[PDB]
Paper text:
FMDV is a non-enveloped single-stranded RNA virus belonging to the family Picornaviridae. The capsid consists of 60 copies each of four structural proteins (VP1–VP4). During assembly a 95 kDa polyprotein (P1) is cleaved by the viral 3C protease to yield VP0 (36 kDa), VP1 (32 kDa) and VP3 (27 kDa) which self-assemble to form the capsid. The structural proteins are arranged in an icosahedral lattice of 12 pentameric building blocks which are the major structural intermediates for FMDV assembly and disassembly.
Here we have rationally engineered a disulfide bond by mutating a single histidine residue at position 93 of VP2 located at the icosahedral 2-fold axis between adjacent pentamers. Initial production of empty capsids utilised infection of mammalian cells (RK13) with recombinant vaccinia viruses that encode a P1–3C expression cassette, where P1 (derived from FMDV [name]) is either wild-type (vA22-wt) or carries the [name] mutation in VP2 (vA22-[name]). In situ room temperature X-ray crystallography was used to determine the structure of both wild-type and mutant capsids produced using vaccinia virus at 2.2 Å and 2.9 Å resolution respectively. The crystals were essentially isomorphous to those obtained for both [name] virus and [name] natural empty particles, and refinement, using strict 15-fold non-crystallographic symmetry and real space averaging gave reliable maps and models for both structures. However, one region on the surface of the particle showed a significant structural difference: residues 171–181 of the VP3 GH loop adopt essentially identical folds in the two natural particles, whereas in wt and [name] recombinant particles their structure is more extended and almost identical to that seen in another serotype A virus, A10. Recent work on EV71 has demonstrated that maintaining the proper positions of the 2-fold helices (which harbour the [name] mutation in FMDV) is essential for maintaining native antigenicity, suggesting that the approach we have demonstrated here may be applicable across a wide range of human and animal picornaviruses, including polioviruses and coxsackieviruses. One group received [name]-wt and the other [name]-[name] capsids. Two of the four animals immunised with wild-type capsids and three of the four immunised with mutated capsids were fully protected using the criteria described in the European pharmacopeia. Baculovirus expressed wild-type and stabilised capsids produced equivalent titres of neutralising antibodies, following a standard immunisation regimen, over a 34 week period post immunisation. Although as yet we do not know if forming a disulphide bridge will be possible for all serotypes, especially in the baculovirus expression system, our results demonstrate that capsid stability can be augmented without compromising immunogenicity and this might be a general tactic for improving vaccine efficacy.
Numbering used by the authors:
A (entry chain D): 80 to 85
B (entry chain C), D (entry chain C): 1 to 221
C (entry chain C): 1 to 56
E (entry chain B): 12 to 218
F (entry chain A), G (entry chain A): 12 to 134, 156 to 210
The structure:
Amino acid sequence: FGALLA
Amino acid sequence: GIVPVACSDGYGGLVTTDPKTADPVYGMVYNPPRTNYPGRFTNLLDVAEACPTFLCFDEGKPYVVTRTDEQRLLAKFDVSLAAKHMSNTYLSGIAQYYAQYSGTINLHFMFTGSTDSKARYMVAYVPPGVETPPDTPEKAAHCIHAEWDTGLNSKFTFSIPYVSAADYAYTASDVAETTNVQGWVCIYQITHGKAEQDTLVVSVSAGKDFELRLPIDPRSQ
Amino acid sequence: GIVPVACSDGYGGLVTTDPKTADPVYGMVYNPPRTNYPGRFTNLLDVAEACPTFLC
Amino acid sequence: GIVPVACSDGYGGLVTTDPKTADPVYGMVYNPPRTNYPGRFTNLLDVAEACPTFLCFDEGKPYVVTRTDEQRLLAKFDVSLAAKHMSNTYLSGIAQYYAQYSGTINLHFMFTGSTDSKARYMVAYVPPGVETPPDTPEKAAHCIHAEWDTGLNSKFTFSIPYVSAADYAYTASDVAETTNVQGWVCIYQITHGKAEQDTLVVSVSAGKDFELRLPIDPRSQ
Amino acid sequence: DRILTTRNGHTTSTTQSSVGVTYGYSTQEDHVSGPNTSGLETRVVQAERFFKKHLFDWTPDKAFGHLEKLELPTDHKGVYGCLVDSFAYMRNGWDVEVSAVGNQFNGGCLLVAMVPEWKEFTPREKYQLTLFPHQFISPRTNMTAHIVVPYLGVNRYDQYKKHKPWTLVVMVVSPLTTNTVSAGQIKVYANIAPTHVHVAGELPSKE
Amino acid sequence: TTTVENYGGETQVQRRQHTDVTFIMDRFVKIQNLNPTHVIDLMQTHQHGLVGALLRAATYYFSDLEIVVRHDGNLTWVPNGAPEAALSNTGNPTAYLKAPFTRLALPYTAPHRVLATVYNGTSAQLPASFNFGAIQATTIHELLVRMKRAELYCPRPLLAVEVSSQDRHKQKIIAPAK
Amino acid sequence: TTTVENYGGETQVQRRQHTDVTFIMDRFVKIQNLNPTHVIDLMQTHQHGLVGALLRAATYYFSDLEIVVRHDGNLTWVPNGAPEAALSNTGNPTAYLKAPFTRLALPYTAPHRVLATVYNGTSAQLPASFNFGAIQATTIHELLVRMKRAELYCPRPLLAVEVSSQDRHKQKIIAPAK
């Protein structure tokens, strides 16, 4: 859910 | 023969700002590459426009508050880069090295209250020409002003317009000046609901068309 | 070597009407526009020819 | 009239390194041809890279030896062009006239023992950051190192890598420097077989990327 | 929507109270390989992961200007820490996340910033800390600040035992306010992770 | 960024030439603490001077230099990292006395890619390698430094004089006589 | 030639401009032992001076010259092989006193294809023909020589100061004050 900063 | 010349009187002296370049004495020096070094700035105003700094209020506070919930003037300050309220800003730090300016100056307001606190503020630009600043929103309403709520967006921005007779204005303020030359900015609290201990943080940055000209070295050295 | 020159006697002095221009020291100054400012005169005689004045 | 000029203050003085050339006074001198004169060098580093010179050990010896056949540190020296062990090298002789350097430095090892003597050595680069140099091969093994045998090829070469924070390093060493800034080089004898009186001659030359910059005249004159 | 999940190595942080990620000065890293390392540098990904540290307890008594700092890197008892003792030179960026958990009824504001070459700031200079990569934390808006900065400094590689380029700074902009419904105090924690970790001069064993 | 258009105004054209970093730093400034043997360190400029303060308003910088020196005897310059003893020999760039003073162009010679105005650690004080070399002469009366091709990185606080008047800092501005 | 590639390293790019023979020798150096009548001999440079030592680090050399002379009265130069008595006549290149000193360009005038810094035999001392001529004036206060278009052949030893400290030769390196 939402944004990812992998 | 050789070339005849006339050594002209009044020329040749060293001028701390002349465009001449000296003669090199140590050549062929290659310096480590600086390509892609982070954080470079090429113009002071690029920084001044992107990084608002805090205004200075009552007791060195970058914010204003209020206990009563009636209409009241929260703060009033001179529209001068030499104003006390601006003394700790980056904009004023930069401006002190220039004799003149012109353009927009941006004020940023940030509400730090809890979710259960709401407030309605008003900011107005009072041009020069009046003896004393308006003490109430009613009187100030006739001036260029903006009013706003504190909801999901706790931040608000207002532009102080450049409005003077001349195309430029001085950055410094002369001792002769009784009433500020560029007018005042007034921040009122129309009213609030349970926001007695909550504050409004104010900061300032340069506007898109803000401009400084004529560099000077004024500080006492 | 370098360029040989002869500093000539009698030249170089300041003359209140010489055509020389001094060296600039403060650059890049842009001045407010003056285009279309009313009442400009470029020659004294233009004025003298269009505005008679009273004899005494 | 004639050309007006401004004799500028601060210019014109003689500078021992200026690029100006004087005015000739005796012309048309033809000199005997020098085409094809043997042994010309155009760059000091070409020579420094092709002619290793001897390091200076214990008693002005360009070599190290050992009586015991156990693991032992044969020699340890500062990775500095001002190191005592380098004091008699051509590289240091050249380096003294430059403020900074960077690049590879090559160490050459030559075994002078008889055919009946065999030995196994190890050389390691100990970067700055440790209080004292490793006294045993075991400890030094974790550093950049090389180990080798003495057989038909009695010569071995090892490159001391340039590893520092800055892109350049000083050639001189300041009195403030307690522990060497560029680390140490350690030469160990892993073990040997009947090589008690046999020696290992060590020399140094410049690496392919060794570089010196910023000439100086430091010697007391 | 407003829910951010950051992942560094085998560690993740899912923040629901996020404003976004602020990248300081640049989004790219100056070539990790330069002439000062003679191509002997390597990357140690096993060290690029989160580690925690408590900064301070934000209370109503702390007024404007109260400043807390954490110079990076700090003592690390993990893989990263091992690197610091095994190599002479290192370089790395920082993925920083700071959280001040209270409740929507607390008021007040905190300034979270990453400062290059820390120096003790004077009361007056504090009004300009926004000149540095920062983000604000205000209970009504967010409980988590998130900043990402690259490596920098006069030298391409550093010796962290002698110099610490980046310094995390948290300052009270507006004091914490409390209701009968709010929290009494807010504990500020930091979730930090080194980035693009490179080592260079391998040292000997201390035994 | 907000503009006056929000309430019917019109944003004008701006000429930021004078706030250009390279331009503003490009001028001569004094260095007050002098000695017969002096190491050129830009941090020796006055902290409130036009250039001194702007320089300190940045973390990292780079620039070549141009200097003016009024001295007695001959002037000798030595690059960054050179032994102090070298200043005594003519092999190094030496300028022979020519009134009223000597003006030279010096290149950046530090071993670092850039220098800093503040350094958090040990080499308080800044590392010794943060210099543009040293100059020496029998006597050095005055020294003017000029930053050529300046580059500034990572801005830091810059302060105006603090105000006590509680409203505006007033001071005598130039005006005609009579 | 070995490189750091042997153990995983990477050889970098090098700029050898400063170790170029022509460039390095191209600068003014002093000559200390002076007389009203002086024969220009490059071996009169200091043995440890930047140029003096580098010159001695070569067996054979060639170069034109440029000199600076601070003198009283007029300066007269005479070519290699000229009778000493000739220095008294104006027919030879003579420079009339002009403060603060005289700077001239002189050509190599030796009868040999090249000169030497060491000579094993008789013409210890070097042959008398190893000179760039002679100069004369009422009084010669200072003399600076400069090797133009220098060429060096057959390198010889070049030594650094010897070390006693048994580890490193340490000396005061320039650094900021305060």
